[PDB]
Structures are given as C-alpha cells and as structure tokens.
Ligand binder design. Structure first.
Ligand SMILES: Cc1cncc(-c2ccc(N[C@@H]3CCNC[C@H]3OCC3CCS(=O)(=O)CC3)c3[nH]c(=O)c(C)cc23)c1
Ligand SMILES: Cc1cncc(-c2ccc(N[C@@H]3CCNC[C@H]3OCC3CCS(=O)(=O)CC3)c3[nH]c(=O)c(C)cc23)c1
Lengths: 130, 130
C-alpha cells in the first residue's frame, strides 16, 4: 500500500542519515569505499562479501533494506571483515580493528537513541507479510 | 533438512557450470569481471546495480540464489545494464549490445536444455516455505 511505501521511504531516509554521519567521521574513512585492490591484492580472495559505506548507500537506494536489522547486518559485516582480514598484533591491524569496533558501536548507539522501536517493529511486520 | 541442503548444493553446482561455460566464451569477455573505472568513469553513476559473471560466481558461493529464476535475474541484469549504458548507433555500442543479448540467449538456451523443470519447481517450493 501507499502507507507501507511511506514506511520504507522513511526507513531509507533514516538509514541514509545514519550512514552519512558515519561516513563523515574521520576515524571511519577506511570503511567509506571499497578497498583499493592495488593496496590489498589478496582481499578479494580472503574476504568473501566485501562491504563499505558507499555500498551501503547504494543498497539503501536499491531498496535492499526493509528493516534496520538488515542494515545492521551490513554494518556488522564491515566490522567482522576488518577483524578477519587484519587479525595481527601490529599497530596497523590494531588501529583498523579498533576503528571497526568503533564504527559498529557508533551505528548501534545512534540507532538505540534515534530509532523508534515501534517503527522498526512495523518494518519487520511488513517485511514478514511479503 | 539435509535433503533440502542437497537440493541447493546441486543448484549451486549447476549454476557454476553454466556460468563457467558463459565465462570462457570469447564473446562474453567484457562481462567476465566488474568494469574498469578508468575506462568507464561514469559507469558507477549511470548503472545502479553493476553485475558481471565473477560476481555471479561469488553470489552462488554465498548461497544468494535459491532458484534458477533468481540467477536468471542477474544474467538479465548484465544484459539490461549493457543496453542501458551503451545505447548508441556506433559500432562499439552495437557490438556490446549484440554480445549482451547473446549472453542472455545463451544462458536461457542452456537452462532450457539442461534444467529439469521439476528440479526448479522443488527449489521454488523450498524457497517459498522459508
Ligand atoms: C588507502 C587504502 C585503500 N584500500 C585499502 C587500504 C588498506 C590497506 C591495508 C590494510 N591492511 C593491512 C594488512 C597488513 N597489516 C597492516 C594493515 O593495514 C593497517 C592500516 C592502518 C591504517 S588504516 O587507515 O586503518 C588502513 C589499514 C587494509 N585492511 C582493510 O581491512 C581495509 C578495509 C583496507 C586496507 C588502504
Ligand atoms: C577493457 C574494459 C574494461 N572495463 C570496461 C570496458 C568498457 C569500455 C567501454 C564501454 N562502453 C563504451 C561507451 C561509449 N561507446 C563505446 C563503448 O565501448 C564499446 C566497446 C566495444 C568492444 S567491447 O569489448 O564490447 C567493450 C565495449 C564499456 N561498456 C560496458 O557496458 C562495459 C561492461 C564495459 C565497457 C572495457
């Protein structure tokens, strides 16, 4: 219905705003775009589902997220990919892992403060009906 | 169940084989990998969901296709993207559009000859039950 279309449109607006706020944070610059294959040639083979914030934006615009829960799976993916690909004790790996966890924590904190639980429940019940 | 897991495993095997046969065809080399942004800088802005045969393989391996119908949507996407991005009368555009339609026709012809309709129906009914 038109009312359900309005619901998903509001969701997309909410998700774009959260994603933009993450993307403009200097700490998360490394997650803003797909990895440069020249800098990490084995990334494509090691990480089976790459994810980044520009890709998240594209997925929002393609109507791929019907719930905030689905969105948070991709945010979690950005984080888990970073922990998987950069597991070492060296400062470089530890920096990106810290930033990865900070990205996840920040996304979850924004959603906790700004997502209405009844709005999310509505989205879930529309998703389940289809 | 284990029987349903076997069904989707057979599907993935079937889809990998079809995709490999398309990928080794010289005509379809242009569709084998994501576009080089240096050669087509405006592609990312013009084409909202890029698709290619290496990405199709990754999606198979990530269990993204539960039916051959879902697979054929991405094959159709490779084709429609080519018709959208290369619409002109020039020989270059007409060549890639011909190859795009040939890729689609070839995928559909292989599936018509080699996909058992009862196998596809089973996949669809498992997909619908979830
Ligand atoms: C400008 C740029 C463009 N494309 C990719 C990189 C990069 C480069 C190296 C990585 N991993 C290295 C694996 C081996 N040990 C050191 C690690 O680099 C640490 C470095 C710290 C600073 S940063 O800005 O967080 C980038 C990663 C990466 N590891 C990653 O997980 C990602 C997402 C990127 C990355 C950088
Ligand atoms: C080696 C390589 C790597 N990455 C991208 C290209 C490329 C380059 C140009 C395109 N479109 C042009 C737009 C303007 N008019 C001429 C068109 O090129 C025609 C050319 C014919 C030969 S081919 O091998 O089919 C590549 C396309 C493309 N148009 C496309 O749709 C795709 C998928 C690719 C492409 C080539």
């Amino acid at each position: 219905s038109m009312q359900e279309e309005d619901t998903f449109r509001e969701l997309r607006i909410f998700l774009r705003n959260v994603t933009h706020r993450l993307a403009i944070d200097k700490r998360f610059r490394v997650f803003t775009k797909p990895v440069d294959p020249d800098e990490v040639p084995d990334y494509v083979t090691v990480i089976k589902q790459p994810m980044d914030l520009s890709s998240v934006i594209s997925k929002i615009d393609l109507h791929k997220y019907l719930t905030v829960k689905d969105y948070l799976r991709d945010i979690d993916l950005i984080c888990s990919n970073a922990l998987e690909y950069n597991p070492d004790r060296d400062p470089g790996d530890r920096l990106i892992r810290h930033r990865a966890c900070a990205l996840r924590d920040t996304a979850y904190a924004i959603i906790k403060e700004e997502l209405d639980e009844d709005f999310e429940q509505l989205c879930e019940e529309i998703q389940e009906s289809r």
